[PDB]
Amino acid sequence: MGVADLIKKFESISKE
Amino acid sequence: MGVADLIKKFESISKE
Amino acid sequence: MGVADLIKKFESISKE
Amino acid sequence: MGVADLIKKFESISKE
Amino acid sequence: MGVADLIKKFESISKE
Amino acid sequence: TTALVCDNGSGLVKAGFAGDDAPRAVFPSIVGRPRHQGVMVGMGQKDSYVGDEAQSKRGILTLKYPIEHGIITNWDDMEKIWHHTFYNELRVAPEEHPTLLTEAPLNPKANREKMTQIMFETFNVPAMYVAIQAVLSLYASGRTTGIVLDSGDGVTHNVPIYEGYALPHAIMRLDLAGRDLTDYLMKILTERGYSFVTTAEREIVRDIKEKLCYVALDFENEMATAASSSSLEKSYELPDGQVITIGNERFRCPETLFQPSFIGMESAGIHETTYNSIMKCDIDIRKDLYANNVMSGGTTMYPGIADRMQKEITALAPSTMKIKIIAPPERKYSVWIGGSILASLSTFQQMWITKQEYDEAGPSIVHRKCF
Amino acid sequence: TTALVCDNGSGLVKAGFAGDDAPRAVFPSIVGRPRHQGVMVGMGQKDSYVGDEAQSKRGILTLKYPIEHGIITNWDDMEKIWHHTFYNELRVAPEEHPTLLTEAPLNPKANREKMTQIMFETFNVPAMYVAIQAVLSLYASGRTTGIVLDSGDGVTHNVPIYEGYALPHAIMRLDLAGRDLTDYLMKILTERGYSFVTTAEREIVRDIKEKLCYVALDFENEMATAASSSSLEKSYELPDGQVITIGNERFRCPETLFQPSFIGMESAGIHETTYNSIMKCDIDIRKDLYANNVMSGGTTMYPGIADRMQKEITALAPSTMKIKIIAPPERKYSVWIGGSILASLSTFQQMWITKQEYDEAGPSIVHRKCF
Amino acid sequence: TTALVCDNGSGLVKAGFAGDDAPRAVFPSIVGRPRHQGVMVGMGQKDSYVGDEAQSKRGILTLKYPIEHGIITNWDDMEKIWHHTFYNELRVAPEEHPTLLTEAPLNPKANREKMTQIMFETFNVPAMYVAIQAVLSLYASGRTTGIVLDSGDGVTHNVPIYEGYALPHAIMRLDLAGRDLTDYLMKILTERGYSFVTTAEREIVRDIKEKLCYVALDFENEMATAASSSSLEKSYELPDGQVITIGNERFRCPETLFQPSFIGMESAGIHETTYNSIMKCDIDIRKDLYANNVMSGGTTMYPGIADRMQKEITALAPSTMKIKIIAPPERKYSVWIGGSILASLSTFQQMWITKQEYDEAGPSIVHRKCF
Amino acid sequence: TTALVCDNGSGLVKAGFAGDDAPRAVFPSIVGRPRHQGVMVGMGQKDSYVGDEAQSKRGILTLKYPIEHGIITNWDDMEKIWHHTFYNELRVAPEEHPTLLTEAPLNPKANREKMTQIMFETFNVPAMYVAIQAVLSLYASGRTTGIVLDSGDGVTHNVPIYEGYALPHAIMRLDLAGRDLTDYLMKILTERGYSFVTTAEREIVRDIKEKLCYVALDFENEMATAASSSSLEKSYELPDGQVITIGNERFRCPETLFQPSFIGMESAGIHETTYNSIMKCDIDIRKDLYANNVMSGGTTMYPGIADRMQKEITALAPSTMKIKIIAPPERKYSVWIGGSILASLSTFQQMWITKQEYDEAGPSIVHRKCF
Amino acid sequence: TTALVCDNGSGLVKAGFAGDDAPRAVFPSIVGRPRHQGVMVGMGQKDSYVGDEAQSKRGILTLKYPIEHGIITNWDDMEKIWHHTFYNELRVAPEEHPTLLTEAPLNPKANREKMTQIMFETFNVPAMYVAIQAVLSLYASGRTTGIVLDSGDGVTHNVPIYEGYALPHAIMRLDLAGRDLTDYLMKILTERGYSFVTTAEREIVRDIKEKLCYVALDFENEMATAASSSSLEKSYELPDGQVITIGNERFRCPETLFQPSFIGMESAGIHETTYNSIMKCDIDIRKDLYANNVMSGGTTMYPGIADRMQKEITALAPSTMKIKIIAPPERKYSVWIGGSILASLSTFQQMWITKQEYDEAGPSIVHRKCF
Amino acid sequence: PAWXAXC
Amino acid sequence: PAWXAXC
Amino acid sequence: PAWXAXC
Amino acid sequence: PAWXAXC
Amino acid sequence: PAWXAXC
Ligand SMILES: Nc1ncnc2c1ncn2[C@@H]1O[C@H](COP(=O)(O)OP(=O)(O)O)[C@@H](O)[C@H]1O
Ligand SMILES: Nc1ncnc2c1ncn2[C@@H]1O[C@H](COP(=O)(O)OP(=O)(O)O)[C@@H](O)[C@H]1O
Ligand SMILES: [Mg+2]
Ligand SMILES: [Mg+2]
Ligand SMILES: [Mg+2]
Ligand SMILES: [Mg+2]
Ligand SMILES: [Mg+2]
C-alpha cells in the first residue's frame, strides 16, 4: 500500500 | 545370554 | 558377440 | 570398329 | 569521411 | 511346527522362527517403484521392487515406507512385504506355522485389527498373536521388571513393567524417532553446502548418520570444541566417489532426542520422558525402575547414548539412588529375540488366537491384552 | 544517511535506497565475457560486460550468472555486480550508508559469511544486516502472519510466520525455479523443431516464456484442447525477424511447478509443498496460514498461477475452510519493498552489525537470527 | 518374415535383416544430380544418381545429403534412398516384412511422423517401429546399464540408461558431428595451401580425415611437437595423382570434439557433455554410469579417442572411482546390430505399430515410447 | 531415308550417308577462279572450279578456301561447295534426307545460324542437326569418357567429356592448325633457297608437309643431329620435275604445335593446352581424362605425334598415374564416322530440327545443345 | 617517420603514406617481358617492364601477374613490384619508415611468412605489420560492426565483425573474382565473333568490362529485352580503331557473381555467400550485420551491384528486417584508406613487429592476430 | 541450418 | 551443480 | 583475319 | 592453379 | 501426517 504507509503501520505495531 | 537360556529362565520363573 | 547369442542373452534376461 | 557395331554398342548403352 | 577525421574518431574511441 | 516370528517395524522387517537367536530376514520395509520411463522392454522390467531389491536400485525408484510412526498406512505395500517375507526370504508356507507379530503401544486399534484380518484371510495363518515390543524387550533381557525405552525408526516409547505387571497409565510415547533424526540431518547438512533431497539420498544420509553420529555427553562443550577445532571433523565417501566432510552435525543430529525443540517439538526429551514415566508409577516401584532402565531399538545404538542417559536421569532423579542403564549390544534385535522366546514358552501356547476363534469372535478378540 | 537496500538475487539485482517504493537498479545478475577474437583494437574493446551492458551484446558473450540456486558460486563476478551497483547504477559511496542484503533460507552458511566479509572489507560498509526474503515479503504485504511462497529464478521456498514468529521446522525449499523452467522450455521447443542452445538463446527463450506461457487451470483439458485446436497457438518474433510458432509449450512449461517429474524431480509440486509446510505447523495455526497464502517472486507472474494454486490447495486441504491467495501485482518487487520498509523502522536500527562489532566478533555475528 | 532393419543415418544407410550380424546395404545417404549440360544423348543419361552410384560419378554431381544433423530435410530424396534400399540394395518386397527404423533423441516430432507416413503409405509396410540409436547401442553391447555416446556424421548424443530405464532429463545432445569435423578440416587445410571447395572435394577431404587424423592425448604437446618436427607429417595421394602433405591438421581436426570453440560453438566438449549427463543423474547411479561409458558411431573411430576420453573424464570426475570406456571395433555397426537384436526378441513383437493401428490412431501412435 | 552426314571442314569436305564407314565425297573445300585472260573461247571455259576440279587446274586459279579457322567467311563459295556435294559428288536430292552438319566449339553463333538458314531455305532439307566434332570423335571411339584433341586444317580444340556429360568451362581452343603449319613451312623452306608463294604452291607445300614431316621426340637432339648429319635429309620431286631437298624443316614445322612461339603466338602448345583442360576439370575426373586422351583430325597424322604427346603430358602431370593416348589410324575420318553413328541412333531421332519447327521458332532453335 | 601503407593486391598496387586520403602509387601488379627478338640494340632495350610501363608496351610483352587469387606465386616478380613501389613510385627509403601490408583472410600461412622475410631482409624495413583488408574496410567506413564483402581482382571474401570482435568461423571466401569475370567475358564475346586471346587482349577486355558491364536487377527480364531489342547494345572502340559492338554480354558477365555456375563453379553466389556468413553468426548478431552490409573492392563498382545485392538478400532473409547496403564511391580505395587510418592510431603502435623482435622470434611472430 | 530456428 | 554434493 | 576483331 | 592442390 | 488428525 506504499512504503510510507507500511512504515507507519509497523512503527505503530512496534510501539503498541 | 541367548534365547535357549532366556527361555529356560522364564519357564522356570513361570512355574515357580 | 553376435546377434544369435545376444538374442539368447536378452531373451533369458526377459524371462528371468 | 565399324559403324554397324558402334551403333549396336551405343544403342545398348542408351537402353541400359 | 577522410583519414584525418577517422583518426580523430578512433583515437577518441580508444581513449574513452 | 515352530511359530514364525515377525517384527514388522517401520524401518526393518525382522523375521524368522521361534526358538532361535536371530532373524533370518532383515531387509528394510521399503517398496519402491520406477519413477522413469522404461525403454529396454526386452529385459523384463518390473513395476515394483522390495527391500534389499529396492535399495539396490534406489536411484531410479521413489522408495517409500508402508509404515510411518508405527502405523501401517499402505496396506497393499504391506502385503507385498509380507508376501516376500514368507515366500522369498524365509521360504516357508504360512499355513504350516502360527505367527507372532508386533506393534507399538498406544497405536490405533484399527492397525491391529487390519493386520489380523490379513494374516487370517490372505496368508491363512492357523493362529496369531500380537505383542508389544516393550514387553518383548524384557523377555529378551531375562527379567520381569524395568522400563523399556524402545527407540526405533518409527516411534520411541517407554513401558514400565513390575513383576510382570504392566503400568499402562505410565506409558509414554513420542513420535520422535530415527526417521526424524535422519530428516533433521538432511536439513542440518545444508549449512555446509551439502544437499540431499531425494529418497535415495535420504537413505544415503541415513547411512551417514549410522557411521558418523555420536551423543555429546556435554552438548555445549562439544559445540565449543567444534567451533574451535578440526578434530571432530570426519569425512565420508558418497556412492559417486564424492567426499563430504561433516563437522558438528555429528552430534547435533542425535541431540534432537534430548532437545526435540530442534525439530519444532515442544515435547520432553527422552530423558525427561523416561523420568516422567517413572514419576507416574507408585512411589514404591520407582527404585526398581531406576535400577532397570532397559534400552532397545536401533536408535539406541548411537555411541554415548547410554552414558548421556545416565547423566541426564541422575540430574532429574533424587540423589542417593542407583540409576542403572542396561544396553546390551543386540539392541537392534532384542525385540525379535523376545518374540523368539515368548512364542516358545509352553505358558504362551494358550495365548494364540486360533483362526477358528477369530472366525466366531470377530476382531474384538485381537484386543485380548490390548494394553 | 538512508540505508542501501540490495536484493542480490540470482536473476535480477534489485537495489536502491531504504524508505522508497522501487529499486533504482534492476539490471540482471549477469557477467559476460567475449567468446571471440577481438580484431578492431582501435575501439577500446572490453574484457567483460555487466548486466544490461552484457545483455545488449549477448550474441558475442558467454553470459553467465554468478549465483545459481540462490548460492553465490563466482565471487569475482559477484564483486563486479556489486561494484557496478554501487558506483554506476546507484551512484553512491558505500562508505556513507549501511546496507541491507538478502538471502534464501536454508542456504550454506558460508554464503552469508563471505558476503559479509566483502561488504565490510571491500566496500567498507559501516554496517550490515542480512534478511530472508520470505520475511521481507510479509513486511511488504502489511502483515505479520502467513506463508510466503517466494518463487524466483534461483529457488522456490515456503516460510510460515505466525504473529511474527517463525516456524523454521516448517520451511520447505525446492531447487525448482524460473531458470529450470526456462531450461525445460528450451528443451520442449525441440518438439516443434526450434533449437535454442547458446546462452544468448537462453535469454531469448526466457523472454518467450515471460510473454507466452500461462498456467492451465486444468492441465488435461488444455492438452486435449491443444491436440484439437489452433486457438492456443501464438506467434513470437525472434530478434532476427524469424517467426516461431508455439503451441502447448505455453502451458506445459509452467506445469513443471505442479509436476516436477517433468524435469526428473521426484519432489512434490509447489501446491503440495505449500500444503506440507502448513501440515508441519501446529494444528492451531493452520487456519491462519490457509487464509494468508502470500505469493511473491518473479515466477508467480504466470497468468493463472494464483488460480491454479487455490484450486490445488483446496483439493488437499479439508473442506469448510477459507483458503486465500494474496497476489498483488508487485510480486517482482515485494522483496525489495520489504527491505525498504525494514531498514527504515526505528525498531530495526539495533539489528545492524556495526563494522566495529564484526571486527571483534568475527563471522559468527552474521548468524544472529540466522534462521 | 524376418523384420527389416534400416538405420537411415545422415552419413550412411545401414540396412538388412533382423537376426544377423551385419547390414547388407552400407551405401551413403547421398543423392546427386548432374550440374552440367548433357551432350551424349545416345547414352541414356540419368537425372539423378544414388549412393555408391553417385559417389562413383561425384565429379559431375552436386552431391547432397537428404539428412542434416539427424533431421530429414529433403523427403523426395529420402524416398529415393529408401526405394533403392528396398528394391535394388536388399532386393526385398517391403510388403512382406515389418520394418525397424531409427532416429536421434530430441529430434523434431514431425521427423518421426513423416517417416511413418511414408513407410505405411508409400512402401506399404505391414508394421513399423522407431528406435533410438542410443538404446540400440546397449542391446548391441550386451547390457542394460550405461551411457551411450553415439557420435556420427549427423549428431552426437548421450543417453544414460540404468537397469533398462532411461533417464531422459539427462540426455545431452550436440549438433557437432563428423560432417562438421570434415568442414573444419576443409578449412584448416587452407593454411598449407590446399583448397577443397566442391562437394566432390568434401568427400575427398572426408576420406583424408578417415585415414590420417588421430586424437592427441595431450593437445599442447602434439602442437609443440608438430612445431618442431616432420615426424607427424603424412602424405596422401589425391585422386588425380597429386600428393598433399598434411601436418598438425591430423590432430587439430578431431580436437574440435574436445574444444568446439574451434568452430565457433560455446558448447561443452564431448567429455564435459558426457560428464554433465552423469551429473544430471541421481547420485546413486553415477558409479555404474562411470563404469559403463559406451562409445558408438563412426566418429568414435579416431585412433586415440577412447584414451583421450578416459583421460578427460578422470580429470572432471572425483578420484577413487573406476572410469571405464567400452569401445568395441564395430562402433560403426553397433546401432544396426542393436536393431538386428531388438527386432528379433519375442518381447518386442508387441511393440510394432501395425498398419491397422496406425490407420485408426493416426500419428500420435508413433510416439509410444517417444522418449 | 538415310540421313546425310557432312563434315564441312575448312580443309576437306567429308560427306556421305549415315550408317556407313566412310565418306563418299572427300574433296577439298576449295573454290578457284581463273586469274588469267581466257582466249580459247571455243572450249567453253568456266568462271569457277570446285574441289578436285579446282586443284587439277590450280596453276591458273587463285584457289581460296571459304572457311578459315573454322568460320565460314565466304557464303557464296560455301553454297557452291554444298551444291556440288549434294548433286555431283553424292548424287542425292537434299529434299529426301535429313542432314547432320558439324562445327567447331566456341565458334561465332552466326556461323551456325547462317548455315541453318541455307540448309532449310536453299537446299530444302526436311530436317537438320549440328554437332560438335569433339563429341562425334568419342562416339567414333566407342566411349563416353575422355578428351578429344581435334586438330585439323582450321582449328585445334580440346573438349573433355565424362560419362557423356560435357565440361564446357574446360574447352580449350587454339587457332593454330594445319593451315598455319603449312604457312610456316612455306616460310621455313626459304632458308634453303626454295620459294613457294602462290596458292598453287601452297598446295604443293602442303603435300610436302604430309609426306616428309615428323615429330621430334626430342627437339634439341634432332636439331643437333641435323646440324651434324645428312641422314635426316630427304628429297621430294616437285610437279615440274625439279628436285627439292629438305633438311630439319621436316621436324621444325610440326614443332610449332609444341612451340607456337615459332609463328608468333604466346599461347600454350598443344600438350600444355591439353593439360590445362584437364586442370580445369574437377579433381575427381582427372584420372579418367588422363587415361582417355583421344586424338583426331588430320594434323594428328604426323609420325611421332602421339609419342611426343605422351612424353610431354607425363612431364606436366603428376607421376604415378596412367597417361594414355588413343590414336587409331582413321584420325582423318573419326569425325565423319561419329556423324555416321549419331545420325543412326534411335535416341537421336528426336534431336533433329524439323523444318516445320525452324519455321516457327526461328534461329534460336539451332542453339539447343549449343555448347 | 610516417608509416608506409601498401596494399599489394593481385590487380593493382595501392601504396603511399599513412595519415592521408589516397595512395600515391596506383599502378598494376604486372611484370611483363619481351616475347620477341630485339633488333635495335642501339636503343638500350630492357629485359622487363613494370606496371604502367608494362601496360604501355603490352602488345610486345607476355604480361603476367605475380599474384593470383590473392596468393603470391612469383616472388622475383613481386620483389620487382616492391622495388619500384618504394624507389620509383613513392621515392622513399624503406629503412626510414615502418610498413603496413595487407593480405586476404584464409590465405596460405607461407604467403605471410615469405612476405615478412622479404620486407625485413631485402628492404630492411624497421618494422612491419600485416592486416586483413576486410578489417581495414570497416575502419575506413567509420564503424566497428558489419560484414565486409571485399571483391577484387583476386578473391572475394566476407568477414563479419561485431563490436570490433571478429567471427572467424563465419568467414566465407570465394575464388571468384574480377579476373575470372574478365576471363569469362573474353569467352562470351566469342559468340558475336570477337576473339581476344593474348594477355594484351585480356587487358583490353578488362577495359571493356569496366566501361560497358552492369548488373541486371532482373536477369531474365534483361535477357528477354536483349533478345528483342537493340537498346541495350553499346559500341566500343578498340585501340586499333576497330569498333566492337557488345549486346547482352554487358550483363551476362557480372551475372557470374550471382550464378558462378556460368564458369563451372558449384559454389554459392555472392548473395548466398553473404547470407550464409550471417547464418554462421550467433542469432543475436544477425540484425546488426544485416544493417551493416559493407561493400568494398573494385568489382563492387559495377552499376547496379548494390541494388542487386539488396534485392537478393531480402529474398533469403526473413521479412520485417532492415537490410542495408553501404557502398561509398571509394570502394576501390577503402582498403588503402583503412591502412592509412590504422597505421596512424596511437593504439596501433604496439602492434608493429619490430625487426628486432622478428630476428629473435622467427616467423611465428607474423601470426599474432593471424585470423 | 537444418533445424528450424537455430541450425 | 551449485550446491556442493547434490546440486 | 577470319574472326571479327582478333583473327 | 595458384593454390597448391585445388586452384 | 501418518496418524489421522495430528501426525
Ligand atoms: N550405528 C547406529 N547409530 C544410530 N542409529 C542407528 C545405527 N544403526 C542403525 N541405526 C538406526 O536404527 C533404525 C532401525 O531401527 P530398528 O529397531 O532396527 O528397526 P525398527 O525401527 O524398524 O523397529 C534406523 O533409524 C537406523 O538408522
Ligand atoms: N510474465 C512472466 N511470467 C512468468 N515468469 C516471469 C515473467 N516475467 C518475469 N518472470 C521470471 O521471473 C524471474 C526473475 O525473478 P525475480 O524474483 O524478479 O528476481 P530473483 O529471481 O533474482 O529474485 C525470471 O526467471 C523471469 O523469467
Ligand atoms: Mg521396532
Ligand atoms: Mg528473489
Ligand atoms: Mg548413426
Ligand atoms: Mg575437322
Ligand atoms: Mg584488394
C-beta of G28 in contact with ligand 2 (< 6 A): no
Q: How far is J80 from chain E (nearest CA, A)?
A: 29
Q: Nearest residue on chain G to E16, judged by CA atoms? A: G44
User: Which grid cell is J15?
Assistant: 601504396
What count of other Cβ atoms lies within 10 Å of the Cβ of residue G329?
Answer: 8
Distance G151 CA to ligand 2 centre (A): 8
- CB I58, CB I201: distance < 8 Å: no
Q: Are residues J196 and J80 in the same domain?
A: no
User: Which grid cell is F93?
Assistant: 508356507
C-beta of G297 in contact with ligand 2 (< 6 A): yes
The CA dihedral of I214, I220, I226, I232, to the nearest 10 degrees, is: -20
Q: How many angstroms separate the CA atoms of H95 and J72, rounded?
A: 63
Judge: N3–H196 Cβ closer than 8 Å, yes or no: no
Q: The cell 626430342 sits on which residue? A: I218
Judge: G347–A10 Cβ closer than 8 Å, yes or no: yes
Cα dist. H318→F237, H269, J170, L2 in Å? 10, 19, 38, 16
Of J144, J282, J317, the CB nearest to G43: J144
Ligand nearest the Cα of residue J333 is 7
Judge: H60–I319 Cβ closer than 8 Å, yes or no: no
CATH code for the domain in which residue I81 is found: 3.30.420.40
Of H21, H139, H347, the CB nearest to C2: H21
Q: The cell 550440374 sits on which residue? A: H35
C-beta of F339 in contact with ligand 1 (< 6 A): no
Q: Are residues I222 and I79 in the same domain?
A: no
Distance J133 CA to ligand 7 centre (A): 7
Q: Are residues F121 and F76 in the same domain?
A: yes
Of G19, G20, G346, the CB nearest to A11: G346
Q: J with I: 3 or more CB pairs under 8 Å?
A: yes
Distance F119 CA to ligand 3 centre (A): 20
Q: Are residues G162 and G223 in the same domain?
A: no
3-state secondary structure at position H87: helix
Phi, then psi, of F306 in degrees rounded to 5: -70, -35
Contacts F201 to L, Cβ<8 Å: 6
Task: Read off the DSSP letter of residue H3.
Answer: P
Q: The cell 598496387 sits on which residue? A: J13
- CB H258, CB H251: distance < 8 Å: no
Q: Are residues H215 and H249 in the same domain?
A: yes
10 Å CB burial of residue J93 (0-12, 13-18, 19+) is: exposed
Helices (H) and strands (E) in chain D, counts: 1, 0
The CA dihedral of J103, J107, J108, J110, to the nearest 10 degrees, is: 10
Report the half-sphere exposure of G252 (CA within 13 A, side-chain side).
22
Query: If interface means Cβ-Cβ distance under 8 Å, which residues of chain O face chain G?
Result: 1, 5-6
Q: How many angstroms separate the CA atoms of G119 and I40, rounded?
A: 130
Name the strand (E) or helix (H) holding G50.
strand G49-50
Q: Are residues G60 and G99 in the same domain?
A: no
Report the half-sphere exposure of G87 (CA within 13 A, side-chain side).
9
| Touching C: H residues 120-159, CB under 8 Å | 139-140, 142, 144
Report the half-sphere exposure of G318 (CA within 13 A, side-chain side).
9
Q: Are residues I64 and I15 in the same domain?
A: no
- CB H327, CB H295: distance < 8 Å: yes
Phi, then psi, of J95 in degrees rounded to 5: -60, -20
β-bridge mates for residue J354, sequence order: J127
Apex G153 CA angle, G152 and G154, nearest 5: 95
Q: How far is J190 from chain M (nearest CA, A)?
A: 9
Q: Compute the residue count for chain F.
A: 371
Q: Return the closest-CA partner of residue G6 out of G348, G343, G368.
A: G343
CATH code for the domain in which residue J40 is found: 2.30.36.70
Q: Return the closest-CA partner of residue H32 out of H80, H86, H68.
A: H80
Q: Are residues H279 and H313 in the same domain?
A: yes
Sort residue J166 into left (φ over 0), alpha (ψ -120 to 50) or beta. Answer: beta
- The answer to whether J73 contacts chain N (CB < 8 Å) is yes
With contact defined as 3+ CB pairs under 8 Å, the chains touching M are: I, J
Q: Return the closest-CA partner of residue G323 out of G366, G287, G273.
A: G287
C-beta of G11 in contact with ligand 2 (< 6 A): yes
Q: Return the closest-CA partner of residue F215 out of F283, F295, F159.
A: F295
CA-closest residue to ligand 2 atom 23: G9
C-beta of F298 in contact with ligand 1 (< 6 A): yes
Question: Which residue type does F216 have?
Answer: A
Q: Are residues I221 and I357 in the same domain?
A: no
Judge: M4–I68 Cβ closer than 8 Å, yes or no: no
- CB H179, CB H10: distance < 8 Å: yes
Q: How many angstroms separate the CA atoms of H235 and H208, rounded?
A: 10
- Residues 6+ positions from J241 with CB-CB distance below 8 Å: none
User: Which grid cell is D14?
Assistant: 542408351
Q: Are residues J88 and J3 in the same domain?
A: yes
- CB K3, CB H72: distance < 8 Å: no
Judge: M6–J242 Cβ closer than 8 Å, yes or no: no
User: Which grid cell is G201?
Assistant: 538463446
Q: Which residues of H1-40 are buried (b: 16+ CB within 10 A; e: fewer)?
A: ebbbbbbbbbbbbbbbbbebbebebbbbbbbbebbbebbb
10 Å CB burial of residue J315 (0-12, 13-18, 19+) is: exposed
Helices (H), chain J: 52-55, 75-84, 109-121, 133-139, 178-188, 199-212, 219-226, 249-252, 270-279, 286-290, 305-316, 334-342, 355-361
Q: Which residues of G25-41 are buried (b: 16+ CB within 10 A; e: fewer)?
A: bbbbbbbbebbbebbbb
Technique used by the depositors: cryo-EM
Q: Are residues J125 and J96 in the same domain?
A: yes
Question: Which residue type does G22 have?
Answer: A
Sort residue G222 into left (φ over 0), alpha (ψ -120 to 50) or beta. Answer: alpha
Q: In Å, how far from its chain's centre is CA J197?
A: 23
Number of domains in chain J: 4
What count of other Cβ atoms lies within 10 Å of the Cβ of residue J76?
Answer: 9
- CB H287, CB H329: distance < 8 Å: no
C-beta of F301 in contact with ligand 1 (< 6 A): yes
- CB I332, CB I301: distance < 8 Å: yes
10 Å CB burial of residue K3 (0-12, 13-18, 19+) is: buried
Q: How many angstroms separate the CA atoms of J133 and J257, rounded?
A: 20
- Atom index in ligand 1 nearest the CA of residue F332 equals 18
Q: Which of I345, I348, I349 to mutate to test the interface with D (most CBs of D within 10 A)?
A: I345
- CB I215, CB I308: distance < 8 Å: yes
Of F20, F144, F346, the CB nearest to B13: F144
The structure was resolved to a resolution in Å of 3.5
C-beta of F157 in contact with ligand 1 (< 6 A): no
Q: The cell 630485339 sits on which residue? A: J38
- Atom index in ligand 1 nearest the CA of residue F179 equals 25
Sort residue H44 into left (φ over 0), alpha (ψ -120 to 50) or beta. Answer: left
Q: Which domain holds residue H192?
A: 182-270
Judge: F337–B14 Cβ closer than 8 Å, yes or no: no
Q: Are residues F90 and F100 in the same domain?
A: yes
Q: How far is C4 from chain F (nearest CA, A)?
A: 15
Map chain F to HEC letters: CCCEEEEECCCEEEEEECCCCCCCECCECCEECECCCECCHHHCCCCCEECHHHHCCHHHECCECCEECCEECCHHHHHHHHHHHHHHHCCCCHHHCCEEEEECCCCCHHHHHHHHHHHHHCCCCCEEEEEEHHHHHHHCCCCCCEEEEEECCCCEEEEEEECCEECHHHCEEECCCHHHHHHHHHHHHHHHCCCCCCHHHHHHHHHHHHHHCCCCCCHHHHHHHHCCCCCCCEEEECCCCCEEEECCHHHHCHHHHCCHHHHCCCCCCHHHHHHHHHHCCCHHHHHHHHCCEEEECHHHHCCCHHHHHHHHHHHHCCCCCCCCEECCHHHHCHHHHHHHHHCCCHHHCCCCEEHHHHHHHCHHHHHCCCC
Cα dist. G304→G219, G334, H289 in Å? 12, 19, 41
Judge: L4–G69 Cβ closer than 8 Å, yes or no: no
- The answer to whether J224 contacts chain I (CB < 8 Å) is no
Task: Read off the DSSP letter of residue I271.
Answer: H
Contacts H43 to D, Cβ<8 Å: 10, 13-14
Contacts F38 to C, Cβ<8 Å: none
- The answer to whether G175 contacts chain F (CB < 8 Å) is yes
Q: How many angstroms separate the CA atoms of G314 and G322, rounded?
A: 9
User: Which grid cell is J156?
Assistant: 572475394
- CB J237, CB J243: distance < 8 Å: yes
